[PDB]
């Protein structure tokens with residue numbers, strides 16, 4: 001038993017809720033919140049901008065030090081940093097950004113990072129401003145992640161479409 005509430009169960013291990021991941025993170029304090037990161041960890045908008053704003057820019061400060069030491073992430077890759085006031089840890093995962101022409105097949109590699117964590121609160125990778133079809137992203141998530149994932153979907157309309165079209 002864990003503290004996630006109001007989720008609809010899609011599979012053995014995947015759950016979905018219409019929620020603001022920032023507010024969901026603020027109430028649950030999960031062990032891991034996933035950020036929809038880019039390779040530079042520049043948290044300017046979308047989920048990343050909202051998560052970073054909720055940390056009062058501490059996420060960005062930590063991220064800039066990470067990049068200065070390690071260089072950029074790979075598309076499909078990830079790093080574990082602090083969760084600040086939102087979670088114990090933040091798993092920054094880089095899904096492909098369709099608006100940059102990145103290969104959508106890298107979406108599976110991106111979701112594989114979730115398997116290193118027993119339980120996660122996460123957005124749909126490559127959705128929103130990253131330009132992928134959230135229904136495809138959900139399918140890849142279900143077919144790739146084997147650990148327990150609680151998906152927060154900000155937009156109520158998209159949430160309803162994802163549930164109603166789920167196979």
Ligand SMILES: O=c1[nH]nc([C@@H]2CCCN(c3ncnc4[nH]c5cc(F)ccc5c34)C2)o1
Pocket residue numbers: 019020021022045046047049050123124127128129134152153154155158
């Ligand atoms: O048309 C819409 N509406 N919503 C979206 C996307 C869906 C996939 C990723 N993404 C999110 N997913 C889950 N929680 C979120 N909290 C946020 C706060 C913000 F300021 C910006 C984005 C999000 C967000 C928005 O596409």
